[PDB]
Design a protein around this ligand. Sequence first.
Ligand SMILES: OC[C@H]1C[C@@H]2N[C@@H]2[C@@H](O)[C@@H]1O
Ligand SMILES: O=C([O-])C(=O)[O-]
Length: 781
Amino acid sequence: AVFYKEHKLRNDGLVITTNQGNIRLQFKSEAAIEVLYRADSKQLPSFALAQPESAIKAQLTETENHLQFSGGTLTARIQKRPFAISYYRDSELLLAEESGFQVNKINFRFYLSPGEKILGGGQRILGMDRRGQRFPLYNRAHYGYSDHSGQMYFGLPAIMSSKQYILVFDNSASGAMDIGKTESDILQLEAKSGRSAYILVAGNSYPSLIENFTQVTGRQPLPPRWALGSFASRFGYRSEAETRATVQKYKTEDFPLDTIVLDLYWFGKDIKGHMGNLDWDKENFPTPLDMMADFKQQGVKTVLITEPFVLTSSKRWDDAVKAKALAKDPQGQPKAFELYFGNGGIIDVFSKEGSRWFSSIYKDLSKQGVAGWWGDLGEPEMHPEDTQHAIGDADTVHNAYGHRWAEMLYQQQLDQFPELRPFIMMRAGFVGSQRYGMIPWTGDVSRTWGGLASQVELALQMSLLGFGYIHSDLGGFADGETLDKEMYIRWLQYGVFQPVYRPHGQDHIPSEPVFQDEETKAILRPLVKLRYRMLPYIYTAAYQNTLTGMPLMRPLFFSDEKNPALIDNKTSYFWGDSLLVTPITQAGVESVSIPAPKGVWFDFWKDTRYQTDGAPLTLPTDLHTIPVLVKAGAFMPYVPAVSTTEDYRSDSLEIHYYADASVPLAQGEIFEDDGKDPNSIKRNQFDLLTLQATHTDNQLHFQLARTGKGYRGMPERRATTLVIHNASDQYQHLDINGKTIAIAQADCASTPALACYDQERRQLQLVFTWGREALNLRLHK
Ligand SMILES: OC[C@H]1C[C@@H]2N[C@@H]2[C@@H](O)[C@@H]1O
Ligand SMILES: O=C([O-])C(=O)[O-]
C-alpha cells in the first residue's frame, strides 16, 4: 500500500514523498525522464545516461487525485492514491505502472496494453517480439549457440515498444526481465541490488525515438573509416611469420585488407596460463615493432585482443597485486578463481588503481604501433559473487563491467591520440556503451546455418537500442571439423551488407576469405571489393548514426509504422535507406519470397524492375549473390575499389540513380572527410555532397551541391559519372547549368560521350565535373 504525501520542486526535478520514501523525477530532455526510487538513499550512479546530472525546465500542475510533470512531448502523470505513475505522449498512453516499485530485491511492475509488441533485452534468440518471454539480466557466454538463446554475451536492460517508447532499467546488477510471461499483462523488472531507477524515452516515430534515446544515453562517435574495411582475423595467428604471411596472402590474392587482428597467442604459445602477460611472446613474435610498422607501410593496422583477467601464472600477477589493480575478496586480498585459462584475478576497472594500471599497459602497447583494441570476456565471463570492486560486489556491478572497461580505454586512447578515432571492439557492455565507441560482436557463434540465421535478429535488436556496429564472426566461429563451404559463402555475402566485415573462426578451419578454394574466392573477391566501392554509402550511413542514432541495419517494420505485424520479420532488413537485403540462411534454397514494401524496387544485381502494391516478390537465388532490392529513388554512390582505406580517394565518383515516376522527389547524400579526425563533424571539417532529383512527366532535374568547410586533401573537382536506371527513352535535351548538350543514342560504352542513352539497358549515363559550385542537370522531352 503506497500513497502520495508531499512534493518539492528542487533544482528542476520533482521530489515526491510517499509513505515508502522519496522519488526523484528529472526530465533529461523534452522526451525522456529519469525516475529514481529510494532517492533519499545512497546508490550506484546512473550508467545509462550520457549526462546523468542534467535536468530541464518542466511544467508541474496539481489536482485532487493527480500530479502532472511535463516536458516538450513527454508527460508523467502521478496518481496519488494508490500511488502509480503513468506516461503520456500528447494524450497517448505509453506505459502505466502497476504496483511499480515493490522493494525487498529491487522490483518494478508495469501494465502492458493488449496487442503491445515488445522488442528488447539485447542479445537473445527468441523472436523479435519478446512479449511472453522471461529471461535474466546477467551477461554471460553462450558458446556455440545457433537458433535459440535466452541469455548471451550482451543483454540490455531495455525494451522498445510498438507504442514507440523505450524503457530502460538503469541497473547494473544481476537481474531479470519478465515481459508478460508469468502474468499476461505485466512487465516486471528485477535485480538483486543496484540502482532503483528507470528511464522512459518517447518518440513520434521509430527514428525520432532512437534520436531521443541516443540523445540522452550517448551518440556513437564516428569510427575511423578503416573500421568499415576488410579484417583479417582468426583464433589465432600463432606467430609473426604467420601474421606476416596472412597480410601477404591478401596482397597476393588481391583481396582488400585494412586490419589484421591478433588473438591471445600474441602473449603466449598456449590458450591457458599466459593471460595477463599483456606483452609480446617474443619466441613467436620476435620483432613486433617492425611487424606493425611494416604493416603500416602497406596501409594495414594491427589490433590486439586483451581480457579482464590476470592469471597467477602470468608475468604480471605480482605487479598487479603490488599495484592493487585486481578486485578483492571481503577479507581485502586479491580475489583469485579458476577460469578456463587457469587460476587468476580480474582487473578492477572501477578503481583508480586498476584503471591507471591497465590504462598504462594500453598506452605502452599503443606507442609501439597498435592501432586498435579488442576486449574479449568482459561479461565478465566468470565473476564469482563475492568478488569485490571499488564500488560494489560482482553481482551488483556485473552488467556494467565491460561498459566501464570501454569508457576507460576510450578516455585513455583519446588522451594518448586526440587526433585519432579509437577502435574498441568488445563482447559485453551496457546501455550507452556506444558513447565510448563500443563495437560489439555476437560472440562464439557456431559454424551452422542456425548460427547465421540468428544474426539479423541479434543485429537488429542491438541496433535498435544503440549499437550501430553490431556484427558477427563471419563464416562462424565455434567447432566444426570441416568447412561448410555454402554456409561460409552465404555468411560472407551477408557480411558485405552488415556493419563490420570481420570473418573470424577457430583456426582448425580457415576464417579468412583468402584461404578458400578457387570457386569461393571467385565469388567473394568482387563482393569484398564491392564493400570498398560502396564505402561512400556505408560511411554516410555511419555519419547519420553519429548524428541521430539511426542504425545502419534497419528492420522491415520501419517501412510501415502502422503495421505492427512487420515487427516479427527477422529475415529481410534495410542496409541504409535504399537496399532491402534478404540473406540466404539455409542450404540449397532455390528462390525467396521478399516482403517488399509497396512501391517500385530493382534487382541490385540484374537491374530488373518490380512494382508491388503489397504482395511479396519471388526472386530466384544463385550461389554468387544474395537477394538485394534497391528502392526507386535511391542514389547509390561508389568510388573505385582500393586495397586499403588508407588509399581511399573520391576524385572519381560513380552514382547510380534508380528513376521511377512513382518517386517525384528524391534525395541522397555523400559524407566525405579525412576518414580519421574525431572532431571533423563538430568543427565542420567535411564535404557534404547532396543530390536532389525532381521527376515529372516531361522532365528529370538533378540539383547537386556541397556544404561544409572541407578538409585537407579534399578534391576541389570530382569526375562524376551519373547512371540513371530505368531512364525514359523520350529525353531529347540535356542542359548542364543552362548549356545544352546532345544525348547520344548509341555506343555509350564505347565513346567518351558526355551524355549517352543505352536503349537495351534503359540507362542514361551523364559524365561531368562536380566542383564546389552548385550544379543543375536537366533532362527534358
Ligand atoms: O580469444 C579466444 C576466443 C574466445 C572468445 N570467444 C571470443 C573469441 O572472439 C576469441 O576468438
Ligand atoms: O517518365 C518516364 O520514366 C517514362 O515515361 O518512361
